[PDB]
């Protein structure tokens, strides 16, 4: 419950930062969202998790691999897609 609420709040803050033209904050919010989702995924979904949860989880892995390679344009594209899936998962 509390962890889901923190993820939902983070999605709201990303929306607000985006609407304010504050993409420097969207970068930070996306980075802090990843470990919250990771914890949520490993505790409530995991290997037996729903296909949507697995798609979001692997999407975050692809984002992190793109970030490690410096492909921040790919981070942004993948982040936009994975955020839409998270909004479906959390009904946000």
Residue numbers in the entry: 2 to 93
Can you list sentences taken from the study reporting this PDB entry?
The MID1 scaffold, a small helical de novo protein, was previously engineered for zinc-dependent esterase and Diels–Alderase activity, where it exhibited a pronounced structural plasticity over the course its laboratory evolution. For scaffold library generation, we chose a semirational approach, targeting the original zinc-coordinating residues H35, H39, H61 and H65 for replacements by Asp/Glu. Three out of four hits originated from the MID1sc9 template (termed MID1sc9_4xE, MID1sc9_EEED, and MID1sc9_EDED), while one hybrid variant hit (termed MID1sc9_H1_EEED) showed shuffling with the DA0 sequence in 4 positions, namely T11I, T13S, N19K, and E32L.
Notably, the tag removal improved the K D value for MID1sc9_4xE by 3-fold (K D = 32 nM). Notably, the obtained K D = 4.66 mM for Ca2+ binding of MID1sc9_4xE reflects a 105-fold selectivity for Ln3+ ions over Ca2+. However, thermal denaturation experiments showed a drastic drop in melting temperature for the metal-free proteins, from 66.3 °C for the MID1sc9 parent scaffold to 37.5 and 32.9 °C for MID1sc9_4xE and MID1sc9_EDED, respectively. Lanthanide binding restabilized both proteins to melting temperatures of 43.9 and 45.3 °C, respectively, in the presence of Tb3+. The asymmetric unit contains a scaffold dimer with polar interactions in the crystallographic dimer interface. However, the dimeric state was not present in solution, as determined by analytical size-exclusion chromatography with static light scattering detection (SEC-SLS) in the presence and absence of TbCl3. Even though the protein was cocrystallized with TbCl3, we could not unambiguously assign electron density for a clearly positioned lanthanide ion. A Tb3+-bound structure predicted by AlphaFold3 also positioned the Tb3+ ion in between the residues E39, E58 and E65, further suggesting that these residues mediate lanthanide binding.
